[PDB]
């Protein structure tokens, strides 16, 4: 499926029959993710929901953006995509980069969101995180896929996970390094990383009344828990959940947990409790 | 005496079923805490029983079930659960327990693992430490005096987190002026003493490497009764266990974070397949 | 010897030779403590320092105050005791109840403190903490030392410590219970607990420039770490230290660490680092 | 010559060392084991406080500071034997040892082989073994260092040395560090030293020796340490039996730099203690 949005082609996948009948779950990908990266979650996510997966600009099978852009064009992408598919409201679950989009999207179009689940998410790109991005880009500008791997992924996963499932890491390392060596992937990553520099929804938080459940990884070395602790206080109806011994990629480290929180929060009939 | 009443060993067991129960039903059974009854889960009935058949019951010395004046461990609560499930024609069930109920869930999963599909344990220990045991001796000792005011003050501020206790203090005070009378009646105190003493023998450490039951452990960071290091121990010795920590939350995760508790329970039971191909 | 103060006798102990050129370390006792409860620390504490230990009102071998009193009585006791001994300025270290006294003292007489080390300390008695104190008092009124034991002591130590050294607990238990059963000990505890109800130095915290090192126990179920976190943020020159797997009684669980923190902070020649 | 003052001729190579105070057989000595990016001058701020009641011994290990280079593949073994022979050179029988990061690894190995030459020990931001995780991070540093890019090398190392809070709070201070560090990180000789020091840490493994280390140890752990995480310190503390653990909230891998008062208090306090045995 292709959403001819603006001048470019936007790739999206739909699991389940989309008619106005059912609740939609929209997945907002991380900066290194595509639609196929959520294949393991499709069956569980689309049993009582219509699952909407799509690749953002400069992602996966979607077209490129060779000009300077912030995360704004990704937010407008999400709105126009939903309007294209005739989706009035939807449950939004985003992670990392996608989690940043969801917060911006909840700040501009709250009437298109039922409930929201953000994982491994900051309210604003700190000077610390920005310099990390400059590190990723500078290494990507050399075209060294081996170097680019060894500086990104050990901080995506917790040290415990990387060590425990090291053979799993190595087998994936043999193919990720060639992927990280291609100028196609890297140039897309550079652009996607620069766009995240201007991420700032701090002054939008006290006005986002969208029911939110925040997932926090204790061993997240990219978006540390203190950033999630901040988010939960300034969001009015925010829920917080911490995942012990887990890195920035909670999706893979604890898939049963991730799904439980997402399906559980979206699946609740009532959210107000009479206790 | 009997509808919503299960006569068992010439004694009455009160229970409630929400939804219609047949052979197709996917059941969620709730194992109560040491101070809880079926009515304490009223706020979760609508959500838990939307796509499930909610089975709530009161254990011995609990709620509106009969009393047990003879000394007893938690083994009679484990057999109770089996015979109750058999009585209602329930072969398998999803078990969610908390505190005392979570201890019954573990002992049950060790004895009758075939009667469980999935399990969620919240604020749970694998074994009653000498620390927790002496805390119980203090609860009992004050209960032995009949002082309801004293009993309240030495139990409840440990049920909840300091932050929640402070933030919702007037929710604690209006709920206190009726708790103190409850804590002042002997029968309730007598039930509390026998239930607390039944937990002294909680020990499933040897059973942990054998429990193949898919389990989600709920941990509270500000739990001053069943501390996080206990759940961490449980999640390491169980073969198929997952751990979740709730920041700024007391022993009563049921009441402090009802949204989270529901999401985790419904989410873990509602998953089609726990096998992820990563 | 004895310090006749304020109508009444105050018991104190001095280790070393007292000069005005003395490096004095004053220890502010916990609510259940006395001078005899710091004996194990005496040798280390009084090697390069002159150690002053004293029993506060309703404590140890000091007289009783049957009248209703707050912590401001203990505060004036410390000042007058120091003036009595001719001590102008001294390093003050306190824990629990004594640590609360230290804060009220540092806010009223900052010129009589060189450096301060407070352990297991809050800036204000929370409604939660006070209702705990009401529980202690309400049980203390029944005279049941057996009941009074099991509702106080297991919360003073961490579960790990109480379990690992249960023999150490049980042998002390056979002595603490007869002591907790005396009306003399209980009446003192009740009044010492009632005085701790009015603890509030929140307003004073930004005005305390006294160099402070805050000790916090992760498994403190009485004065939790978040209260220390609050303390370290609103004191301009305060450093924080967290002790893993430790309870409200730092001294007995980690005596090597406690003394290292106290001696190390006081022993430091210069606190300002060109770094 | 051997009239080289503050120079120890070892295996036909020059080892630089600095001593604050005067040395004696009676002298109470503190030996500092540097981090992987550190030298003797990296401890200047601590000199006055550390040498108050102790004889401070600072020295640069191989491929560090002012000491000679190594252009052979070496493990941390040559760093351990260096410490032993340096101590013997100065006539030091026993000494208190404080080590951080890389030097902390040397301390444990030294405590594993020569426990008689240690009085008391302090280790900060320390692992009991180089994990496959920590090892692949080092490969990342090495890979980037190979390119000679100083700007890239800086951005992939230092943000993980300091805590995110600290790095943001004292940010403009970090960027003026950067104007001087980027050229330093661009020099081949510096990068080559960093590579060989990194490769040497790959074979760090003292799990074998932990239950045999009876040395009075105080472990300093940082909560926002993203290179030697807290869980690694908890492991060390449970398999060492004369070990105590202290945690530093809101602090990164460079604990000494973020909390200099705290670091000093723990070191001076744990060493300056006369008798460790408490009758409680």
CSV table of C-alpha atoms in Angstrom, one decimal, chain A residues 4 9 42 77 85 93 98 115-116 123 130 144 146 162 208 218 240 242 252 260 270:
chain,number,residue,atom,x,y,z
A,4,UNK,CA,0.9,9.5,-2.2
A,9,UNK,CA,5.3,8.0,-1.6
A,42,UNK,CA,1.1,-8.0,14.6
A,77,UNK,CA,2.4,13.2,7.9
A,85,UNK,CA,-7.6,6.2,5.6
A,93,UNK,CA,1.9,3.8,20.7
A,98,UNK,CA,8.1,7.8,17.3
A,115,UNK,CA,-5.2,6.9,24.4
A,116,UNK,CA,-1.5,7.2,24.0
A,123,UNK,CA,10.0,15.8,26.5
A,130,UNK,CA,22.1,16.2,21.0
A,144,UNK,CA,32.1,3.3,8.4
A,146,UNK,CA,31.4,-1.1,11.5
A,162,UNK,CA,23.6,-7.6,25.2
A,208,UNK,CA,-1.9,17.4,26.9
A,218,UNK,CA,15.9,1.4,34.1
A,240,UNK,CA,4.3,5.5,34.6
A,242,UNK,CA,9.4,1.0,35.0
A,252,UNK,CA,12.7,-6.6,22.0
A,260,UNK,CA,0.7,-6.2,27.9
A,270,UNK,CA,-13.1,2.6,31.8
